[PDB]
């Protein structure tokens, strides 16, 4: 389903995303905002066998598995089906797996496109937390 920034920012907060790898909570909200538009049921296709899954659009080729995508390395070791859940736990974990260095966030297209270098805080501003 479609969360709320404050609604989700809360869960990401509860799930260890606040200042993870020095990444302000704003960032984690802005991502889901544009990638999935706050929808856990989001599913988008690519220009290959890939299909991005969930609120954080985790990729069927390198991260989760969907037994229908060529060259599936499944680095998060998880079926893409677990990412379309109403529980952002599954996703958040895998998401923590991508961000490896401290610049891992660049991975999200939308984040890198309409989040980097913006007032990302604004996304969490107004939430009780």
């Amino acid at each position, epitope marked *: 389903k479609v969360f709320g920034r404050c609604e989700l920012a809360a869960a990401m907060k509860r799930h260890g995303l606040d*200042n993870y790898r*020095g*990444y*302000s909570l704003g*960032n984690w909200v802005c991502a889901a905002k544009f990638e999935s538009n706050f929808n856990t049921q989001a599913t988008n296709r690519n220009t290959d066998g890939s299909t991005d899954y969930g609120i954080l659009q985790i990729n069927s080729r390198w991260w989760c598995n969907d037994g229908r995508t060529p060259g599936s390395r499944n680095l998060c070791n998880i079926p893409c089906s677990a990412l379309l859940s109403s529980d952002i736990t599954a996703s958040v974990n895998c998401a923590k797996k991508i961000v490896s260095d401290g610049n891992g966030m660049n991975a999200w297209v939308a984040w*890198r496109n309409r989040c*980097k*270098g*913006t*007032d*990302v*805080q604004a996304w969490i*501003r107004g939430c009780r937390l």
Partner: antibody
Amino acid sequence: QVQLQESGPGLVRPSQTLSLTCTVSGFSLTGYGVNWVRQPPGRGLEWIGMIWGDGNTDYNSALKSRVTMLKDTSKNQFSLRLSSVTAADTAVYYCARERDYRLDYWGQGSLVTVSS
Amino acid sequence: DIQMTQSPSSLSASVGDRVTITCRASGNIHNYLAWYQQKPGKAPKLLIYYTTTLADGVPSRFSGSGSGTDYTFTISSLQPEDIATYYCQHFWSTPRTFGQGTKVEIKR
């Protein structure tokens, strides 16, 4: 390889317009923003304002009607124009890079003083 | 406009002592507080962000705790290489404001 270097005049006649330059390197002029802060000789650190990665500006509510900030993805430089300088605009202007709510890379700072 | 009120204006202690500087915010800044260290002659350098999180290379002597409007920064063991002025700056919406900075120094 993150470097900032401010350049500008040292001496400036009052009523004239102050205009320093900040030339960066080692990072994206669009994924990071830049803050200008000044510091009068002996006094503390005053925040003059910023220009977000997305070309946006925000000025301190005092110097607002007289500071203009510009980006120039051409020579990798940001510009600060301080208009009609009295003599308390005498200071060391810094230009720092803002990384996710923290000024982590700072210029060396250039002194600018208004005579008379 | 959230103002930053930092105290003390300067302090003196012996190496080995814990000193504590504080920043009280005119409004809730929500942990978005940062601490810089400045030695005579050069720009300020980052030490801590998001209230407790320290920059790379920073020694452990330093720390920072705080929430709401009350924030505090601690040098657990004043060492000769800590003598500088320390400031705070909030990052809760704009504009940001710096505390006036404390000037730490060696007793005697």
